[PDB]
Amino acid sequence: NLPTAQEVQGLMARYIELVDVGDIEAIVQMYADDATVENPFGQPPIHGREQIAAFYRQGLGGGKVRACLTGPVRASHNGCGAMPFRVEMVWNGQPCALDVIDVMRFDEHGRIQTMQAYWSEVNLSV
Amino acid sequence: MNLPTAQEVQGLMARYIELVDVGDIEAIVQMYADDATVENPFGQPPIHGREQIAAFYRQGLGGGKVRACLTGPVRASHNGCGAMPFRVEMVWNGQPCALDVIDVMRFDEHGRIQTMQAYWSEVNLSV
């Protein structure tokens, strides 16, 4: 149900695994039907499964991207957590890396209810 | 300072880690907005205002046998917020501990910390 701290750690790790593999369908299924994404944080949220699906489609379509944790998942006891990771992608034929922290809140079904992704240009490397 | 740019967020949040590391409680309190809110660890009830925040940091840092260092770059946004990964090192009973933490901060339009959430639990502790 509402994930323990240890379960949050596994779920957020699984999320990164799915991003790395690039399975958009599997990612969207991790989300609650009324979830919101703020990515990057500071931008208007997106709501609902198809909008989130379209977001990840644009972002991860179709290969092109690698992602891995760059430190442990930090987990709370209220079904939330935060994780550091790096996204690798080739942009304009030039390899790029982005350092990101995702903050997630899970619901009582172990689904992602909210996600905030912290990053900006200062976190992009060529 | 006004609302911090992304670069300014990076600098402010790194400075905060430096102050925790030296244990300068008054300098930390001065980085905070006068009516700021701390949630540490996130999930616990919030503490409000510089007096309470001072008391909280003094209980953890008064001794100063605490070390803190970034374990990755500060992630910064364009709306005066950011997040950073770090490790706190401590000695419980001559038993050296390490705690992995991520802090999320929102700064106000004066460059002061308005809210902070610290993400961690015992699964992030190593004794």
Side-chain angles (χ1 to χ4, degrees), chain A residues 2-20:
Chain A
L2 178 73
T4 60
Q6 298 184 7
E7 287 173 332
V8 165
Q9 285 192 312
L11 284 168
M12 295 184 67
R14 168 148 186 80
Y15 170 87
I16 293 295
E17 176 176 67
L18 299 179
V19 168
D20 191 43

mmCIF file with all atom_site columns, all heavy atoms in Angstrom, chain A residues 2-20:
data_model
loop_
_atom_site.group_PDB
_atom_site.id
_atom_site.type_symbol
_atom_site.label_atom_id
_atom_site.label_alt_id
_atom_site.label_comp_id
_atom_site.label_asym_id
_atom_site.label_entity_id
_atom_site.label_seq_id
_atom_site.pdbx_PDB_ins_code
_atom_site.Cartn_x
_atom_site.Cartn_y
_atom_site.Cartn_z
_atom_site.occupancy
_atom_site.B_iso_or_equiv
_atom_site.pdbx_formal_charge
_atom_site.auth_seq_id
_atom_site.auth_comp_id
_atom_site.auth_asym_id
_atom_site.auth_atom_id
_atom_site.pdbx_PDB_model_num
ATOM 1   N N   . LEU A 1 2  ? 0.665  2.147  0.991   1.00 0.00 ? 2  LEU A N   1
ATOM 2   C CA  . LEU A 1 2  ? 1.506  3.346  1.087   1.00 0.00 ? 2  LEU A CA  1
ATOM 3   C C   . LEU A 1 2  ? 2.909  2.931  1.478   1.00 0.00 ? 2  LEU A C   1
ATOM 4   O O   . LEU A 1 2  ? 3.141  2.501  2.611   1.00 0.00 ? 2  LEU A O   1
ATOM 5   C CB  . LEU A 1 2  ? 0.977  4.361  2.101   1.00 0.00 ? 2  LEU A CB  1
ATOM 6   C CG  . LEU A 1 2  ? 1.916  5.574  2.195   1.00 0.00 ? 2  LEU A CG  1
ATOM 7   C CD1 . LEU A 1 2  ? 1.802  6.448  0.950   1.00 0.00 ? 2  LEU A CD1 1
ATOM 8   C CD2 . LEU A 1 2  ? 1.673  6.393  3.441   1.00 0.00 ? 2  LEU A CD2 1
ATOM 9   N N   . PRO A 1 3  ? 3.851  3.076  0.540   1.00 0.00 ? 3  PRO A N   1
ATOM 10  C CA  . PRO A 1 3  ? 5.172  2.451  0.637   1.00 0.00 ? 3  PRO A CA  1
ATOM 11  C C   . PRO A 1 3  ? 5.917  2.806  1.927   1.00 0.00 ? 3  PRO A C   1
ATOM 12  O O   . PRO A 1 3  ? 5.877  3.950  2.388   1.00 0.00 ? 3  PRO A O   1
ATOM 13  C CB  . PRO A 1 3  ? 5.906  3.001  -0.594  1.00 0.00 ? 3  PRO A CB  1
ATOM 14  C CG  . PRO A 1 3  ? 4.814  3.394  -1.536  1.00 0.00 ? 3  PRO A CG  1
ATOM 15  C CD  . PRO A 1 3  ? 3.722  3.911  -0.666  1.00 0.00 ? 3  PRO A CD  1
ATOM 16  N N   . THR A 1 4  ? 6.571  1.806  2.512   1.00 0.00 ? 4  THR A N   1
ATOM 17  C CA  . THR A 1 4  ? 7.500  2.038  3.607   1.00 0.00 ? 4  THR A CA  1
ATOM 18  C C   . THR A 1 4  ? 8.716  2.767  3.043   1.00 0.00 ? 4  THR A C   1
ATOM 19  O O   . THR A 1 4  ? 8.838  2.908  1.833   1.00 0.00 ? 4  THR A O   1
ATOM 20  C CB  . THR A 1 4  ? 7.954  0.732  4.277   1.00 0.00 ? 4  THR A CB  1
ATOM 21  O OG1 . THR A 1 4  ? 8.603  -0.104 3.308   1.00 0.00 ? 4  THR A OG1 1
ATOM 22  C CG2 . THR A 1 4  ? 6.757  -0.002 4.871   1.00 0.00 ? 4  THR A CG2 1
ATOM 23  N N   . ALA A 1 5  ? 9.612  3.222  3.908   1.00 0.00 ? 5  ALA A N   1
ATOM 24  C CA  . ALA A 1 5  ? 10.832 3.864  3.437   1.00 0.00 ? 5  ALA A CA  1
ATOM 25  C C   . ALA A 1 5  ? 11.627 2.908  2.549   1.00 0.00 ? 5  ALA A C   1
ATOM 26  O O   . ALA A 1 5  ? 12.094 3.280  1.470   1.00 0.00 ? 5  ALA A O   1
ATOM 27  C CB  . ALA A 1 5  ? 11.671 4.341  4.616   1.00 0.00 ? 5  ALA A CB  1
ATOM 28  N N   . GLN A 1 6  ? 11.739 1.653  2.969   1.00 0.00 ? 6  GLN A N   1
ATOM 29  C CA  . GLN A 1 6  ? 12.444 0.666  2.157   1.00 0.00 ? 6  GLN A CA  1
ATOM 30  C C   . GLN A 1 6  ? 11.754 0.435  0.805   1.00 0.00 ? 6  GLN A C   1
ATOM 31  O O   . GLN A 1 6  ? 12.415 0.244  -0.223  1.00 0.00 ? 6  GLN A O   1
ATOM 32  C CB  . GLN A 1 6  ? 12.576 -0.651 2.937   1.00 0.00 ? 6  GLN A CB  1
ATOM 33  C CG  . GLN A 1 6  ? 13.385 -0.491 4.219   1.00 0.00 ? 6  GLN A CG  1
ATOM 34  C CD  . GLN A 1 6  ? 13.607 -1.792 4.957   1.00 0.00 ? 6  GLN A CD  1
ATOM 35  O OE1 . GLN A 1 6  ? 13.267 -2.869 4.462   1.00 0.00 ? 6  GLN A OE1 1
ATOM 36  N NE2 . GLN A 1 6  ? 14.177 -1.699 6.158   1.00 0.00 ? 6  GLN A NE2 1
ATOM 37  N N   . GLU A 1 7  ? 10.424 0.476  0.793   1.00 0.00 ? 7  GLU A N   1
ATOM 38  C CA  . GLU A 1 7  ? 9.679  0.293  -0.448  1.00 0.00 ? 7  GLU A CA  1
ATOM 39  C C   . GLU A 1 7  ? 9.801  1.500  -1.382  1.00 0.00 ? 7  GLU A C   1
ATOM 40  O O   . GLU A 1 7  ? 9.892  1.345  -2.603  1.00 0.00 ? 7  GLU A O   1
ATOM 41  C CB  . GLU A 1 7  ? 8.210  0.013  -0.147  1.00 0.00 ? 7  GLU A CB  1
ATOM 42  C CG  . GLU A 1 7  ? 7.969  -1.390 0.404   1.00 0.00 ? 7  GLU A CG  1
ATOM 43  C CD  . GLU A 1 7  ? 6.546  -1.599 0.858   1.00 0.00 ? 7  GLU A CD  1
ATOM 44  O OE1 . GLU A 1 7  ? 5.890  -0.616 1.260   1.00 0.00 ? 7  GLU A OE1 1
ATOM 45  O OE2 . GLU A 1 7  ? 6.082  -2.761 0.822   1.00 0.00 ? 7  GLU A OE2 1
ATOM 46  N N   . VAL A 1 8  ? 9.791  2.694  -0.804  1.00 0.00 ? 8  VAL A N   1
ATOM 47  C CA  . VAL A 1 8  ? 10.036 3.908  -1.585  1.00 0.00 ? 8  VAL A CA  1
ATOM 48  C C   . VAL A 1 8  ? 11.371 3.806  -2.311  1.00 0.00 ? 8  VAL A C   1
ATOM 49  O O   . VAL A 1 8  ? 11.463 4.123  -3.496  1.00 0.00 ? 8  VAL A O   1
ATOM 50  C CB  . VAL A 1 8  ? 10.018 5.164  -0.692  1.00 0.00 ? 8  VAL A CB  1
ATOM 51  C CG1 . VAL A 1 8  ? 10.625 6.375  -1.437  1.00 0.00 ? 8  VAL A CG1 1
ATOM 52  C CG2 . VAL A 1 8  ? 8.596  5.477  -0.274  1.00 0.00 ? 8  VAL A CG2 1
ATOM 53  N N   . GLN A 1 9  ? 12.401 3.354  -1.595  1.00 0.00 ? 9  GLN A N   1
ATOM 54  C CA  . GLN A 1 9  ? 13.728 3.153  -2.186  1.00 0.00 ? 9  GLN A CA  1
ATOM 55  C C   . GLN A 1 9  ? 13.696 2.229  -3.395  1.00 0.00 ? 9  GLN A C   1
ATOM 56  O O   . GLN A 1 9  ? 14.354 2.473  -4.411  1.00 0.00 ? 9  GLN A O   1
ATOM 57  C CB  . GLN A 1 9  ? 14.695 2.577  -1.151  1.00 0.00 ? 9  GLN A CB  1
ATOM 58  C CG  . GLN A 1 9  ? 15.187 3.565  -0.109  1.00 0.00 ? 9  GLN A CG  1
ATOM 59  C CD  . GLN A 1 9  ? 16.342 3.014  0.691   1.00 0.00 ? 9  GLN A CD  1
ATOM 60  O OE1 . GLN A 1 9  ? 16.290 1.880  1.176   1.00 0.00 ? 9  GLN A OE1 1
ATOM 61  N NE2 . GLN A 1 9  ? 17.407 3.808  0.822   1.00 0.00 ? 9  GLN A NE2 1
ATOM 62  N N   . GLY A 1 10 ? 12.948 1.143  -3.274  1.00 0.00 ? 10 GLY A N   1
ATOM 63  C CA  . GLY A 1 10 ? 12.838 0.218  -4.382  1.00 0.00 ? 10 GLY A CA  1
ATOM 64  C C   . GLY A 1 10 ? 12.050 0.799  -5.531  1.00 0.00 ? 10 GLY A C   1
ATOM 65  O O   . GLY A 1 10 ? 12.404 0.614  -6.688  1.00 0.00 ? 10 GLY A O   1
ATOM 66  N N   . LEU A 1 11 ? 10.970 1.503  -5.217  1.00 0.00 ? 11 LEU A N   1
ATOM 67  C CA  . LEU A 1 11 ? 10.115 2.040  -6.268  1.00 0.00 ? 11 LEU A CA  1
ATOM 68  C C   . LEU A 1 11 ? 10.826 3.107  -7.083  1.00 0.00 ? 11 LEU A C   1
ATOM 69  O O   . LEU A 1 11 ? 10.746 3.123  -8.309  1.00 0.00 ? 11 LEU A O   1
ATOM 70  C CB  . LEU A 1 11 ? 8.834  2.612  -5.679  1.00 0.00 ? 11 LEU A CB  1
ATOM 71  C CG  . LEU A 1 11 ? 7.791  1.574  -5.249  1.00 0.00 ? 11 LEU A CG  1
ATOM 72  C CD1 . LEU A 1 11 ? 6.727  2.255  -4.427  1.00 0.00 ? 11 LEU A CD1 1
ATOM 73  C CD2 . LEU A 1 11 ? 7.177  0.891  -6.466  1.00 0.00 ? 11 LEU A CD2 1
ATOM 74  N N   . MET A 1 12 ? 11.523 4.007  -6.400  1.00 0.00 ? 12 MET A N   1
ATOM 75  C CA  . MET A 1 12 ? 12.223 5.063  -7.113  1.00 0.00 ? 12 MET A CA  1
ATOM 76  C C   . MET A 1 12 ? 13.395 4.504  -7.916  1.00 0.00 ? 12 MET A C   1
ATOM 77  O O   . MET A 1 12 ? 13.660 4.942  -9.032  1.00 0.00 ? 12 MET A O   1
ATOM 78  C CB  . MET A 1 12 ? 12.673 6.147  -6.124  1.00 0.00 ? 12 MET A CB  1
ATOM 79  C CG  . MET A 1 12 ? 11.481 6.843  -5.485  1.00 0.00 ? 12 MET A CG  1
ATOM 80  S SD  . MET A 1 12 ? 11.871 8.214  -4.374  1.00 0.00 ? 12 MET A SD  1
ATOM 81  C CE  . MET A 1 12 ? 12.542 9.433  -5.518  1.00 0.00 ? 12 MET A CE  1
ATOM 82  N N   . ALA A 1 13 ? 14.074 3.507  -7.360  1.00 0.00 ? 13 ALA A N   1
ATOM 83  C CA  . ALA A 1 13 ? 15.093 2.779  -8.108  1.00 0.00 ? 13 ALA A CA  1
ATOM 84  C C   . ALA A 1 13 ? 14.488 2.089  -9.337  1.00 0.00 ? 13 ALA A C   1
ATOM 85  O O   . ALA A 1 13 ? 15.090 2.104  -10.397 1.00 0.00 ? 13 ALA A O   1
ATOM 86  C CB  . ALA A 1 13 ? 15.777 1.759  -7.217  1.00 0.00 ? 13 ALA A CB  1
ATOM 87  N N   . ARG A 1 14 ? 13.304 1.498  -9.192  1.00 0.00 ? 14 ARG A N   1
ATOM 88  C CA  . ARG A 1 14 ? 12.646 0.847  -10.332 1.00 0.00 ? 14 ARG A CA  1
ATOM 89  C C   . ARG A 1 14 ? 12.326 1.863  -11.407 1.00 0.00 ? 14 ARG A C   1
ATOM 90  O O   . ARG A 1 14 ? 12.509 1.611  -12.596 1.00 0.00 ? 14 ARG A O   1
ATOM 91  C CB  . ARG A 1 14 ? 11.367 0.128  -9.908  1.00 0.00 ? 14 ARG A CB  1
ATOM 92  C CG  . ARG A 1 14 ? 10.506 -0.295 -11.100 1.00 0.00 ? 14 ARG A CG  1
ATOM 93  C CD  . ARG A 1 14 ? 9.739  -1.569 -10.828 1.00 0.00 ? 14 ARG A CD  1
ATOM 94  N NE  . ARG A 1 14 ? 9.031  -2.056 -12.015 1.00 0.00 ? 14 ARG A NE  1
ATOM 95  C CZ  . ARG A 1 14 ? 9.610  -2.731 -13.003 1.00 0.00 ? 14 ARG A CZ  1
ATOM 96  N NH1 . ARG A 1 14 ? 10.912 -2.985 -12.963 1.00 0.00 ? 14 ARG A NH1 1
ATOM 97  N NH2 . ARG A 1 14 ? 8.890  -3.146 -14.038 1.00 0.00 ? 14 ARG A NH2 1
ATOM 98  N N   . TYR A 1 15 ? 11.859 3.031  -10.980 1.00 0.00 ? 15 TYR A N   1
ATOM 99  C CA  . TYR A 1 15 ? 11.563 4.110  -11.908 1.00 0.00 ? 15 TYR A CA  1
ATOM 100 C C   . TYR A 1 15 ? 12.772 4.440  -12.787 1.00 0.00 ? 15 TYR A C   1
ATOM 101 O O   . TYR A 1 15 ? 12.645 4.578  -14.004 1.00 0.00 ? 15 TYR A O   1
ATOM 102 C CB  . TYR A 1 15 ? 11.106 5.350  -11.138 1.00 0.00 ? 15 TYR A CB  1
ATOM 103 C CG  . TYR A 1 15 ? 11.005 6.595  -11.982 1.00 0.00 ? 15 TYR A CG  1
ATOM 104 C CD1 . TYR A 1 15 ? 9.844  6.896  -12.677 1.00 0.00 ? 15 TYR A CD1 1
ATOM 105 C CD2 . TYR A 1 15 ? 12.073 7.491  -12.069 1.00 0.00 ? 15 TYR A CD2 1
ATOM 106 C CE1 . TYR A 1 15 ? 9.746  8.046  -13.457 1.00 0.00 ? 15 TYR A CE1 1
ATOM 107 C CE2 . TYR A 1 15 ? 11.990 8.633  -12.842 1.00 0.00 ? 15 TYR A CE2 1
ATOM 108 C CZ  . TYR A 1 15 ? 10.824 8.917  -13.525 1.00 0.00 ? 15 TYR A CZ  1
ATOM 109 O OH  . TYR A 1 15 ? 10.745 10.050 -14.291 1.00 0.00 ? 15 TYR A OH  1
ATOM 110 N N   . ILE A 1 16 ? 13.942 4.576  -12.164 1.00 0.00 ? 16 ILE A N   1
ATOM 111 C CA  . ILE A 1 16 ? 15.155 4.902  -12.897 1.00 0.00 ? 16 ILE A CA  1
ATOM 112 C C   . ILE A 1 16 ? 15.507 3.780  -13.875 1.00 0.00 ? 16 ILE A C   1
ATOM 113 O O   . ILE A 1 16 ? 15.905 4.042  -15.009 1.00 0.00 ? 16 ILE A O   1
ATOM 114 C CB  . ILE A 1 16 ? 16.333 5.150  -11.946 1.00 0.00 ? 16 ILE A CB  1
ATOM 115 C CG1 . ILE A 1 16 ? 16.082 6.426  -11.130 1.00 0.00 ? 16 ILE A CG1 1
ATOM 116 C CG2 . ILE A 1 16 ? 17.633 5.274  -12.722 1.00 0.00 ? 16 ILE A CG2 1
ATOM 117 C CD1 . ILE A 1 16 ? 16.038 7.701  -11.949 1.00 0.00 ? 16 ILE A CD1 1
ATOM 118 N N   . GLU A 1 17 ? 15.343 2.541  -13.420 1.00 0.00 ? 17 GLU A N   1
ATOM 119 C CA  . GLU A 1 17 ? 15.506 1.374  -14.285 1.00 0.00 ? 17 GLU A CA  1
ATOM 120 C C   . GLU A 1 17 ? 14.611 1.473  -15.522 1.00 0.00 ? 17 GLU A C   1
ATOM 121 O O   . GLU A 1 17 ? 15.060 1.232  -16.651 1.00 0.00 ? 17 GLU A O   1
ATOM 122 C CB  . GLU A 1 17 ? 15.202 0.098  -13.504 1.00 0.00 ? 17 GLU A CB  1
ATOM 123 C CG  . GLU A 1 17 ? 15.252 -1.169 -14.346 1.00 0.00 ? 17 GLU A CG  1
ATOM 124 C CD  . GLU A 1 17 ? 15.029 -2.416 -13.519 1.00 0.00 ? 17 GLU A CD  1
ATOM 125 O OE1 . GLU A 1 17 ? 13.902 -2.603 -13.011 1.00 0.00 ? 17 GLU A OE1 1
ATOM 126 O OE2 . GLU A 1 17 ? 15.987 -3.202 -13.368 1.00 0.00 ? 17 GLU A OE2 1
ATOM 127 N N   . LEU A 1 18 ? 13.356 1.864  -15.327 1.00 0.00 ? 18 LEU A N   1
ATOM 128 C CA  . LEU A 1 18 ? 12.425 1.966  -16.459 1.00 0.00 ? 18 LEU A CA  1
ATOM 129 C C   . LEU A 1 18 ? 12.757 3.113  -17.415 1.00 0.00 ? 18 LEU A C   1
ATOM 130 O O   . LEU A 1 18 ? 12.599 2.985  -18.631 1.00 0.00 ? 18 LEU A O   1
ATOM 131 C CB  . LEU A 1 18 ? 10.994 2.121  -15.954 1.00 0.00 ? 18 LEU A CB  1
ATOM 132 C CG  . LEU A 1 18 ? 10.405 1.001  -15.109 1.00 0.00 ? 18 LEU A CG  1
ATOM 133 C CD1 . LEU A 1 18 ? 9.001  1.380  -14.698 1.00 0.00 ? 18 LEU A CD1 1
ATOM 134 C CD2 . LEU A 1 18 ? 10.386 -0.297 -15.916 1.00 0.00 ? 18 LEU A CD2 1
ATOM 135 N N   . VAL A 1 19 ? 13.208 4.242  -16.872 1.00 0.00 ? 19 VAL A N   1
ATOM 136 C CA  . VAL A 1 19 ? 13.652 5.355  -17.697 1.00 0.00 ? 19 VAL A CA  1
ATOM 137 C C   . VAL A 1 19 ? 14.843 4.943  -18.551 1.00 0.00 ? 19 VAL A C   1
ATOM 138 O O   . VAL A 1 19 ? 14.908 5.259  -19.743 1.00 0.00 ? 19 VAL A O   1
ATOM 139 C CB  . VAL A 1 19 ? 14.031 6.585  -16.824 1.00 0.00 ? 19 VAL A CB  1
ATOM 140 C CG1 . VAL A 1 19 ? 14.772 7.619  -17.650 1.00 0.00 ? 19 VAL A CG1 1
ATOM 141 C CG2 . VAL A 1 19 ? 12.773 7.204  -16.226 1.00 0.00 ? 19 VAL A CG2 1
ATOM 142 N N   . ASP A 1 20 ? 15.761 4.201  -17.942 1.00 0.00 ? 20 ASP A N   1
ATOM 143 C CA  . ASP A 1 20 ? 16.974 3.760  -18.620 1.00 0.00 ? 20 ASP A CA  1
ATOM 144 C C   . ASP A 1 20 ? 16.628 2.843  -19.789 1.00 0.00 ? 20 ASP A C   1
ATOM 145 O O   . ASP A 1 20 ? 17.175 2.980  -20.880 1.00 0.00 ? 20 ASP A O   1
ATOM 146 C CB  . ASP A 1 20 ? 17.895 3.027  -17.649 1.00 0.00 ? 20 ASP A CB  1
ATOM 147 C CG  . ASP A 1 20 ? 19.272 2.789  -18.231 1.00 0.00 ? 20 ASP A CG  1
ATOM 148 O OD1 . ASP A 1 20 ? 19.813 3.717  -18.866 1.00 0.00 ? 20 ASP A OD1 1
ATOM 149 O OD2 . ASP A 1 20 ? 19.801 1.669  -18.071 1.00 0.00 ? 20 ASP A OD2 1
#
